[PDB]
């Protein structure tokens, strides 16, 4: 009775598998191609589990990239990006941000304590800001404003969305990333304010302040100015 007896495998079985494959090398190309993507993924999937069933081992290339971003590791996911036979997802820009904003935050984090100790810089901080605000090479997938509108595949809340500032939609986020010094807050607010002004000039629309949202939006620029004036 068979039922009586009822990642390490990702190594062991693959061992004899590649052993037989090489012995033969000393349909099959189709067969090898199916196994061609395994070991790296097998590594990566093991790298996925080690980061934290075959259900975990059968994620769609979208869900595959999802798990790759899950731990927040870009270097390991880079190979999956290169060999996935697909390069269409905003997660590309997400990886862009994870690669850039990380070192950006490290530099900013050092810059704050450096500034305090010197008092015990603004141009460099603004430069680090632009390092996300401006792209040296290809534009950031989120760098487009209507890219948010691009994500809209359509309403009553479209006007609410017209209050959005995608260029700041990450700028305020990062200001909340770790901004932790007095003038540092001052700048991380003021530069984002410059961004908002640029958004409105690009928006070319008036500030319908009285335009209360029935759906339940409390005001993107409204909340922004609330924080600004509160800091003031």
């Amino acid at each position: 009775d068979l039922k009586h007896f009822t990642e390490f495998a990702i190594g062991a079985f693959l061992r004899l598998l590649q052993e037989q494959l090489d012995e033969i090398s000393s349909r099959l190309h189709r067969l090898s191609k199916v196994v061609s993507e395994a070991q790296w993924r097998h590594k990566v999937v093991t790298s996925n589990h080690r980061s934290e069933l075959i259900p975990m081992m059968f994620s769609p290339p979208e869900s595959l990239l999802a798990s790759c971003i899950l731990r927040g590791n870009f270097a390991e996911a880079h190979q999956v990006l290169f060999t996935f036979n697909l390069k269409s997802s905003p997660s590309s820009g997400e990886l862009m941000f994870m690669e850039r904003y990380q070192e950006v935050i490290q530099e900013l984090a050092q810059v704050e304590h450096k500034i305090e100790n010197q008092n015990s810089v603004f141009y460099s901080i603004s430069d680090v800001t632009d390092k996300l605000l401006n792209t040296s090479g290809d534009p950031i997938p989120m760098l487009q404003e209507d890219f948010w509108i691009s994500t809209a595949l359509v309403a009553p809340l479209r006007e609410v969305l017209e209050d959005l500032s995608p260029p700041a939609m990450a700028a305020f986020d990062l200001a909340c990333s770790q901004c932790q010094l007095w003038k540092t807050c001052k700048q991380l607010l003021e530069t984002a304010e410059r961004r908002l002004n640029s958004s409105l000039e690009r928006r070319g629309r008036r500030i319908d302040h009285v335009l209360l949202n029935a759906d339940g939006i409390r005001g993107f620029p409204v909340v922004l100015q609330q924080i600004s004036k509160s800091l003031n």
Binding site: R27, R30, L31, V34, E37, A38, I54, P55, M57, F58, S59, P60, E62, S63, A66, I69, G72, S91, E94, M142, W148, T151, A152, V154, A155, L157, V160, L161, L164, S165, P166, A168, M169, A170, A171, F172, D173, C176, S177, Q178, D215, G216, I217, R218, F220, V223
Partner: protein
């Protein structure tokens, strides 16, 4: 019977296990991408929210869970506040939770010797328990809050019942009310034993101390400034009294008898 040469994506098997996922808002929040968090949330869900009230409430519940998950870490807390504000709901439940957990540090760390991570796990378990509305656990948590608050007050090296004392102590009432628990008698007594009326008046007042409690705790002060107080806002065992206050009944013939049958 696997007739087709299958692989990591056997079509029938692929259907048998097609389990896809979208980048849920936890990605941005857990990272901390506030404005983008709300905006992408709306992009995916606001239109998709066929039940805007129900979906909004569900998202709020998720936001509260996420926030409670990360008491110590600063960035997660700030993100939680911003996402709640952009949501369109109250901004006091999460802040109350955060302030309570933070103030619970001192007389759990500077008084007990343990690795901070086990303490964090225990606190998180207790926090989820409180989220279940565990009234007994709620009472224990508030009790510890009072104890640690007293320790912290002492630490600042000031009078235990000065003005800034109440200033820090406000949170004591704040929590109890916020969690719909009976207003605990925190500093009323602490001033009651010390014979300081112009704290049992004021600090009685500016939180709306329900009229039962103030009178009930009035019996701690002194011989003097006690009779001038029990009668202050009112609105036996002595024969010179039981009969003096016997000119008040219907006539008399029953108050005295009813009082005298009871006590032999």
């Amino acid at each position: 019977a696997w007739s087709h040469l299958p692989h990591f994506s056997s079509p029938d098997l692929v259907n048998k296990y097609a389990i896809v996922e979208r980048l849920n808002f936890a990605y941005y929040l857990h990272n901390g991408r506030p404005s983008f968090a709300f905006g992408t949330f709306l992009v995916q869900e606001l239109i998709k929210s066929k039940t805007p009230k129900q979906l909004i409430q569900q998202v709020g519940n998720e936001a509260y869970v996420i926030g409670l998950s990360s008491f110590h870490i600063p960035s997660i807390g700030a993100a939680c506040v911003c996402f709640l504000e952009l949501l369109g709901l109250d901004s006091l439940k999460l802040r109350v939770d955060m302030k309570v957990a933070n103030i619970i540090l001192s007389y759990k760390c500077r008084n007990e010797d343990a690795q901070y991570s086990f303490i964090r796990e225990s606190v998180a378990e207790k926090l989820s328990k409180l989220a279940d509305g565990e009234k007994t656990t709620t009472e224990e948590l508030l009790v510890l809050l009072e104890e640690g608050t007293w320790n912290s007050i002492q630490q600042q090296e000031i009078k235990r019942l000065s003005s800034e004392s109440s200033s820090q102590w406000a949170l004591v009432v704040q929590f109890c009310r916020l969690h719909n628990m009976k207003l605990s008698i925190s500093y009323l007594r602490e001033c009651a034993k010390a014979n300081d009326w112009l704290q049992f008046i004021i600090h009685s007042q500016l939180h709306n101390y329900h009229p039962a409690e103030v009178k009930s705790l009035i019996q701690y002060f002194s011989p003097v400034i006690q009779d001038h107080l029990r009668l202050a806002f009112e609105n036996m065992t002595d024969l010179f009294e039981i009969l003096l206050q016997c000119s008040e009944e219907p006539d008399s013939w029953h108050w005295l008898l009813v009082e005298a049958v009871k006590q032999q």
